[PDB]
Amino acid sequence: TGDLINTVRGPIPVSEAGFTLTHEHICGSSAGFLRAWPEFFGSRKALAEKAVRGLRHARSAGVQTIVDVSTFDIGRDVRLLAEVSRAADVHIVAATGLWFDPPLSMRMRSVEELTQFFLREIQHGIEDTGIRAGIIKVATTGKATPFQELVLKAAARASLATGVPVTTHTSASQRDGEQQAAIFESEGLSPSRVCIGHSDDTDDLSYLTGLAARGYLVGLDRMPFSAIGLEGNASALALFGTRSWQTRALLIKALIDRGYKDRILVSHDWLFGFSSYVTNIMDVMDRINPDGMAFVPLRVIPFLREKGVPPETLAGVTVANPARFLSPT
């Protein structure tokens, strides 16, 4: 009791986070896009209603909290998050940071300037809303660009000043986590404040256990993503991969079997609208996974239980790990 996390509806006790999905999105978009072209998603109203239905379904499956890791450049709309959070009765933690699509007004900034931006969103509020970010999202896609080095350093500095955790996008197959870890540590950030995400996009357990041994959280956060059965759809193939959800889920068991149960975070990287990729990618995704953000509790957790993972361990991963991670420290 006593520790607090900021959500889009205000502060909540850490102990009320409960079953938490730590890498999710209401909408994958771009800054200003939902405002300028809402008809892309049918309408803003259609998008919100779809998100409320999806979050209610996740709620019914036992999900109490999601962390929406949409940054500024993912077109995070904190009013949308608040509306759908309220309607579905699911907590949503908003993010600051920058993903891999920053515009020039961000790309021209120094580490100091980026630190001030991230601190604004954490300490003051996002835009004019007073809604505070509870996490900092960063990204590389292979070796960090010079700008990305600054973003990661600014993320570490903002984390150190606020206790708010950092979570990352990687190209898992390129083992980005190792360089991200080196940059974060160069700023004196504790590995326990860091989740190396999209880590289930690889089966390289040497890479994954290397990180977990150093105290990093390992985000196995793309559980439902697979283009098996869709190999003729080139865009779906490129984004989803050819590994099954069971193959992804097996990595959760693999880490637990190797002593790293306390270092795992599990999620879907799901969304209810998606404008930053090919048109109608949302229809493809909805066909593959109509369960949306209930997929983890309905499919993954029972798979693991049937493979012999004890319920206390499963509770530790889905409840205790996100609580420790999100609790500002």
Report the partner that residue 60 touches, choosing among Co ion, a second copy, none (CB closer than 5 to 8 A by kind): none
- The distance of closest approach from Cβ of residue 128 to Co ion in the complex, given in angstroms and rounded to an integer, is 26
Of 29 and 168, which has the nearer Cβ to a second copy? 29
Rounded distance, CA 208 to CA 214, Å? 10
Of 153 and 248, which has the nearer Cβ to a second copy? 153
Tell whether 91 is in a known binding site.
no
- The distance of closest approach from Cβ of residue 124 to a second copy in the complex, given in angstroms and rounded to an integer, is 9
Report the partner that residue 287 touches, choosing among a second copy, Co ion, none (CB closer than 5 to 8 A by kind): none
Rounded distance, CA 172 to CA 201, Å? 6
Tell whether 201 is in a known binding site.
no
Rounded distance, CA 74 to CA 328, Å? 24
Whose CB is nearest to Co ion?
169
Alpha-carbon distances, residue 288 vs 110, 230, 232, 263 (angstroms) = 42, 9, 14, 29
- The distance of closest approach from Cβ of residue 128 to a second copy in the complex, given in angstroms and rounded to an integer, is 8
Of 197 and 297, which has the nearer Cβ to Co ion? 197
Rounded distance, CA 192 to CA 159, Å? 11
Tell whether 57 is in a known binding site.
no
Tell whether 169 is in a known binding site.
yes
- The distance of closest approach from Cβ of residue 324 to a second copy in the complex, given in angstroms and rounded to an integer, is 30
Tell whether 268 is in a known binding site.
no
- Contact set with a second copy (CB under 8 A): 29-33, 35-37, 39-40, 72-73, 75, 101, 103-106, 108-110, 113, 116-117, 120-121, 126-128, 275-279
- The distance of closest approach from Cβ of residue 109 to a second copy in the complex, given in angstroms and rounded to an integer, is 8
Tell whether 269 is in a known binding site.
yes
Question: 174, 142 in Cβ contact below 8 A?
Answer: yes
Report the partner that residue 269 touches, choosing among Co ion, a second copy, none (CB closer than 5 to 8 A by kind): Co ion
| DSSP letter string, 265-319 | EE-----SEE-SSSTTHHHHHHHH-TTGGGHIIIIIHHHHHHTT--HHHHHIIII
Alpha-carbon distances, residue 6 vs 86, 124, 134, 242 (angstroms) = 15, 12, 5, 37
Rounded distance, CA 28 to CA 36, Å? 15
Please enumerate, by residue number, every residue annotated as part of a binding site for Fe(2+). 23, 25, 137, 269
